[PDB]
A paper describes a structure:
Recently, we described a novel [name] termed the [name] Complex Protein ([name]—NMB2095/NEIS2075), a conserved protein found in the OM of meningococci, gonococci, N. lactamica and all other Neisseria spp.. Nm-[name] acts as a minor [name], mediating the adherence of meningococci principally with epithelial cells. In summary, we have identified a new function for Neisseria [name] as an OM-located, surface-exposed lysozyme inhibitor, in addition to its role as an [name] and as a potential vaccine candidate.
Crystallization trials were initiated on the purified protein, and native data were collected from a single crystal to 1.4 Å resolution. However, there are few main-chain hydrogen bonds linking β4-β5 and β8-β1, meaning that the structure divides into two four-stranded anti-parallel β-sheets (β1-β4 and β5-β8). The interaction between β8 and β1 is stabilised by the disulphide bridge between Cys38 and Cys121. The sequence motifs SxSGAxY and YxxxTKG, which were conserved in the MliC/PliC family proteins, were not retained in Nm-ACPI.
Residue numbers in the entry: 30 to 99, 101 to 123
Write the structure that this text describes.
Amino acid sequence: AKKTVSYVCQQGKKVKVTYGFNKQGLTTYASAVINGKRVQMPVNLDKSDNVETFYGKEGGYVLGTGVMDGSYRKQPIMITAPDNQIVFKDCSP
Ligand code: NA
């Protein structure tokens, strides 16, 4: 099961993100279209905690958000590039 959310961020940047959900109701990935290219970021269970979910791996793009269940449309997000610069900042749905 997929669900898509459109966001507006700092400096007017816009991004659409698609979240995958398994049969347990947990998210498995976040897929963001960045310069026209689909960037799929797998959920990072080692880095996720009671307040924040992270998607992505070292060397790739990394998405950070709140706790995601079928909650997900009310969460803010941020996306950091491989160089560690926050390229989508303070994003709201
Ligand atoms: Na980069």
